[PDB]
């Protein structure tokens, strides 16, 4: 149901709930990730999306399951709007760094800077939509 | 170019060297501790060398390169920091200590094991436990934990630690490990025996199984047992004995039950007497042992010395324990009048008329018949002919009497030994079994114990059969490693990876096809007007003419097989290596079957336990059917590997005995697995040891990063060969020796290397930028899936 690039940059998404690297993701990781960018699940809500797709039933999630256990343009959206924590249609450089240390990234203000610069097409210090896009497939 | 190499070392099994010149098949060798001593070796025998001496890593296949003398390598520095336990893959490596790490083994080493990955801890038999624990409660599969070792090297304290872990982690405690443990004493007075080797050798094979119920709760245990040796019971060379049994009784056994049971001196025994007739004593339980029951080779030589065993100890402890698992003294004294039967049943010889027993052996006869519950005509009738039918196939045929000859007579007697002897064994193990009992359950994990892979300047029949058995499992091993890592390749998304494999059902066939194989066609020598071993032997030759794995012994290397003729021996290719028969005998071992007038004649003992006990196919059928009984076994559960390892042969503490060592994991089948290994990725590390190991040679940018995009950042930079090097989901997987080559990339050219580094900068910016932001998506989704759950 998705092209092996997608699956390829879930793969990396998936490396970030998986914090200690054993390949597999936890109740406590998934909500954990989940809360850093704002959401509030409950204990049972997260074990009971982990059950359904279980299939194996060790009570951990692999990358397969994770897959499974993931209208479309407007999540690509909300997750711009994640970003730009003030939704002035921008995201700024200051804003990268507020999800960047939720999230748990290391890094320097001339490193979020770069990344800031490298994304920005047009050239005004700041990141929209536009290129957001462009930069979530490459 | 200057790397060190291991080059062959007759006591350390290898030595660091540097190569010095070439030859057509060999290598010349300068040894890094002498200036000059160069010498010369196969150049198979070579392996290269970690550069880091004194790197020591938890799983061999962190090596930079994977072989024999790596490994070796590795666990001897594991070995001299008392870390016994070092992994291959899954695979358990135990060396013996020779003394007691109690901190390893406490309550709390214990909990921490606990729901643990194999990995996530330092190696260790508890997490090989827990393994096949959580497999069991998972797939719903009863696991088997398959060890090899020799005689010694600590399978028996392994065996415990697996024990005590499951039955403290997942039951109610010290109750079923106690039970399952105090029984020992008796199993091994019946089943094991002094040999060449080994002063406490078992002769059978051994799965202790602990059961659970659908809770995965322990519920009790039971102990399944194969392949007791026969032979032994009438025979054995000079310095080996029979089983242990018999010496405790007649070391230690009060002079009533010695009158009662007519004992004396095991010279005095046929099925004894061909042994060494020898106690284990020391100066102190020497002077308990009445002198009525000291051989003459006792009596000149002294005491057989152990710091364990001592038959009249043993007796003593033997006795308390059956006493401690409510073995009463009538059913004990059953025990001991059965084996002591069984040794007057040997005594008894014959002679040409068909034969009669001879005059001389009318005592013996008396006692045996007694002794059994026998009446003593129908046992000189029953062991001098046998009962025919007139005719064959279907005819009207009637019962006649055949006298047997005396050769027959013979073997009719030790036919009788045999299956008395192991009916009684079935007996004992049953026995134990009623320690521990339980009603149902759902799985098991089981301990398998059994004698391993081995070979002597002389080889006869009894080897041929331990080594086939050895074959076989090593055969099992290699399928399920070799399963294990293919799996393994697709968890870690390496995509398409066919393992090249060969396989040694080759050898397998050469031993057991129906018809033409070896043990086929000794049977078939039966059957022949006049069988001998040389015509079975060059029968095998002829039919084997274009095999592999099959050479006369003349082709041996080795001088001492030079002047055997072709008919009178051959050499197997074994897994573990070459290994040269000498035929003489195979026939006569061949044969043990005991003709059925005599068997109906035991069964119907006036004697209820010798009832009790009881209520034409050749000895090496047996083996294979018993064998392969053992096999499906093994191939109904989930499998897990420990090779225990004796590193010395004195039980000394601190004492790595590098060549003795090398033969063990050659004897073991570990250089077996390593080589199947190299058709895969035997080498890989994990993205956080890569991290704390390239680091340092990386800009202060990408030291921030996580270890996976870290590892990511690099393994682009460096624009590695797709099919050398695998980025999987937890780990980078290497082809044979590429993590070397991965290494040296990283120190030979740091100008190379900085320019690109910095070049991946837009790859590495784009990368990480994607992964923040397909997380986000994903968190999206899963806040998502709750409400569409939820609608
Ligand atoms: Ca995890
Ligand atoms: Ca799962
Ligand atoms: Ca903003
Ligand atoms: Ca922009």
Known sequence: QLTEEQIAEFKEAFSLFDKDGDGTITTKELGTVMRSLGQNPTEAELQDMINEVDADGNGTIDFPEFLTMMDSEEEIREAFRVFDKDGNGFISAAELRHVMTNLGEKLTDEEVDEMIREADIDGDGQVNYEEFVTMMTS | ?791
């Open chain 2, 1 to 791: 170019d200057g790397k060190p190499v291991w080059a062959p070392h007759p006591t350390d099994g290898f030595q660091v060297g540097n190569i010095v010149d070439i030859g057509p098949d060999s290598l010349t060798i300068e040894p890094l501790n002498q200036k000059g001593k160069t010498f010369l070796a196969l150049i198979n025998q070579v392996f290269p060398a970690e550069e880091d001496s004194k790197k020591d890593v938890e799983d061999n296949c962190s090596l930079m390169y994977l072989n024999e003398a790596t490994l070796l390598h590795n666990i001897k520095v594991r070995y001299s920091k008392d870390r016994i336990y070092t992994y291959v893959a899954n695979i358990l490596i135990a060396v013996n200590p020779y003394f007691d790490i109690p901190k390893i083994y406490s309550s709390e080493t214990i909990k921490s094991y606990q729901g643990k990955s194999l990995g996530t801890m330092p190696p260790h038999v508890f997490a090989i436990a827990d393994k096949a624990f959580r497999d069991m409660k998972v797939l719903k599969l009863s696991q088997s934990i398959i060890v090899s070792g020799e005689s010694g090297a600590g399978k028996t304290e392994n065996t415990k630690f697996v024990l005590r872990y499951l039955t403290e982690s997942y039951g109610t405690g010290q109750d079923i490990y106690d039970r399952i443990v105090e029984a020992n004493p008796l199993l091994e007075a019946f089943g094991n025996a002094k040999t060449v080797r080994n002063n406490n050798s078992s002769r059978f094979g051994k799965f202790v199984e602990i059961h659970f119920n659908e809770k995965s709760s322990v519920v009790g245990g039971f102990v399944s047992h194969y392949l007791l040796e026969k032979s032994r019971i009438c025979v054995q060379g000079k310095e080996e004995r029979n089983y242990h049994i018999f010496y405790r009784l007649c070391a230690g056994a009060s002079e009533d039950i010695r009158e009662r049971l007519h004992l004396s001196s095991p010279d005095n025994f046929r099925y004894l007497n061909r042994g060494c007739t020898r106690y284990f004593a020391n100066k102190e339980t020497d002077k308990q042992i009445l002198q009525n029951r000291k051989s003459p080779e006792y009596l000149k030589a002294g005491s057989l010395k152990d710091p364990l065993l001592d038959d009249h100890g043993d007796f003593i402890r033997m006795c308390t324990a059956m006493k401690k698992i409510g073995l009463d003294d009538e059913e004990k004294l059953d025990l001991f009048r059965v084996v002591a039967g069984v040794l007057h049943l040997g005594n008894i010889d014959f002679e040409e008329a068909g034969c009669n027993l001879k005059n001389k052996s009318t005592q013996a006869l008396e006692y045996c018949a007694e002794l059994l519950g026998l009446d003593q005509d129908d046992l000189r009738v029953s062991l001098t002919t046998r009962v025919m039918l007139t005719t064959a196939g279907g005819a009207k045929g009637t019962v006649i009497k055949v006298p047997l000859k005396v050769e027959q007579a013979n073997n009719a007697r030790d036919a009788l030994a045999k299956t008395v002897y192991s009916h009684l064994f079935d007996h004992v193990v049953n026995r134990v079994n009623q320690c521990f009992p339980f009603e149902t359950s759902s799985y098991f994990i089981g301990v398998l114990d059994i004698a391993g892979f081995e070979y002597f300047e002389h080889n006869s029949f009894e080897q041929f059969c331990i080594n086939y058995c050895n074959e076989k499992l090593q055969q099992f091993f290699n399928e399920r490693i070799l399963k294990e890592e293919q799996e393994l390749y697709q968890k870690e998304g390496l995509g398409v990876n066919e393992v090249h494999y060969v396989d040694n059902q080759d050898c397998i066939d050469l031993i057991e096809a129906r018809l033409v194989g070896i043990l086929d066609i000794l049977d078939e020598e039966n059957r022949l007007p006049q069988p001998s071993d040389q015509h079975f032997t060059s029968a095998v030759h002829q039919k084997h003419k274009d095999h592999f794995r099959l050479s006369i012994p003349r082709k041996s290397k080795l001088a001492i097989h030079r002047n055997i003729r072709d008919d009178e021996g051959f050499i197997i290719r074994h897994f573990a290596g070459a290994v040269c028969y000498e035929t003489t005998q195979f026939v006569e071992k061949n044969n043990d079957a005991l003709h059925m007038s005599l068997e109906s004649l035991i069964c119907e003992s006036r004697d209820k336990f010798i009832r009790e006990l009881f209520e034409f196919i050749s000895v090496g059928n047996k083996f294979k059917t018993q064998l392969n009984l053992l096999l499906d076994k093994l191939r109904s559960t989930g499998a897990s590997f420990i090779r225990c390892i004796k590193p010395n042969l004195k039980m000394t503490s601190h004492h790595f005995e590098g060549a003795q060592i090398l033969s063990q994991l050659q004897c073991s089948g570990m250089v077996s697995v390593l080589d199947l290994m190299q058709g895969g990725f035997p080498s890989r590390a994990s993205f956080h040891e890569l991290y704390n190991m390239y680091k340092k040679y990386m800009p202060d940018k990408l030291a921030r990063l996580d270890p996976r995009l870290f590892c990511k950042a690099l393994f682009k930079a460096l624009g590695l060969n797709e099919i050398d090097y695998k980025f999987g989901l937890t780990k980078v997987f290497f082809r044979p020796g590429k993590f070397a080559e991965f290494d040296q990339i990283m120190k030979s050219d740091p100008d190379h290397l900085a320019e690109l580094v910095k070049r991946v900068n837009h790859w590495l910016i784009c990368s990480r930028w994607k992964k923040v932001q397909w997380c986000s998506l994903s968190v999206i989704k899963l806040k998502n899936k709750i409400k569409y759950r939820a609608e």
